Design a protein around this ligand. Structure first.
Ligand SMILES: OC[C@H]1O[C@@H](O[C@H]2[C@H](O)[C@@H](O)[C@H](O)O[C@@H]2CO)[C@H](O)[C@@H](O)[C@@H]1O
Ligand SMILES: OC[C@H]1O[C@@H](O[C@H]2[C@H](O)[C@@H](O)[C@H](O)O[C@@H]2CO)[C@H](O)[C@@H](O)[C@@H]1O
Length: 179
């Protein structure tokens, strides 16, 4: 057993009651779906390529909706804690289980990402991806910040938390702030 979160009676993987999430890493250079770059361009602010920012799966990104621009959960923060698990052949066990906070600045759409982001309802509705998780976090890795954590697609528990002050201040520059 590489995945340590056991499915509950509804098929949702949990660890000691807490919901689990899968994670991946991505690089694409786009401004992204929360508008964290110059208006009218596809150029991100440097912080949005450098910091701990994430593109969640679409139904969490827009809280049940399908909007891929200024989704309802733009600017929220999530704390991800590795369990030690991973999907066999698609990750590995990390060196420690320190939790890391990420801010939502982009979206992982169902289209083109069916294995990990193809979840047809928001968390709490018992819809899961192909690996049994109710939500997925794709982690921005333009500058190698995920490799610096030594995370190779870890299984995590997840929760929403208030954003650290620096990430709050960053988000104020994004076009979706106050939409
Ligand atoms: O579709 C989500 C995300 O996947 C990333 O690729 C994964 C891949 O699916 C998995 O088999 C392999 O083990 O890990 C890579 C890296 O996390 C891809 O890099 C992203 O562009 C994509 O959004
Ligand atoms: O980059 C501006 C552009 O972002 C679009 O979201 C994309 C995002 O660029 C890409 O990094 C991610 O993997 O997919 C999302 C959703 O397709 C957004 O939908 C556009 O409105 C926006 O102009």
């Amino acid at each position: 057993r590489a995945q340590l979160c056991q499915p509950d009676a509804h098929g949702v993987r949990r660890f000691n009651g807490r919901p689990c999430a899968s994670t991946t890493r991505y690089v694409d250079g786009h401004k992204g779906a929360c508008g964290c770059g110059q208006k009218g361009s596809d150029t991100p602010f440097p912080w949005n390529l450098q910091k701990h920012v994430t593109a969640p799966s679409e139904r969490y990104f827009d809280d049940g909706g399908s909007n891929l621009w200024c989704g309802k959960n733009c600017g929220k923060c999530v704390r991800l804690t590795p369990t030690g698990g991973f999907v066999p052949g698609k990750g590995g066990a990390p060196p420690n289980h320190n939790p890391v906070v990420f801010m939502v600045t982009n979206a992982c759409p169902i289209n083109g990402n069916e294995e990990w982001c193809g979840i047809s309802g928001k968390p709490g509705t018992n819809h899961v991806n192909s690996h049994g998780y109710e939500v997925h976090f794709d982690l921005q890795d333009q500058v190698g910040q995920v490799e610096a954590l030594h995370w190779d697609n870890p299984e995590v528990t997840w929760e929403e938390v208030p954003c650290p002050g620096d990430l709050q201040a960053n988000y104020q520059q994004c076009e979706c702030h106050n939409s």
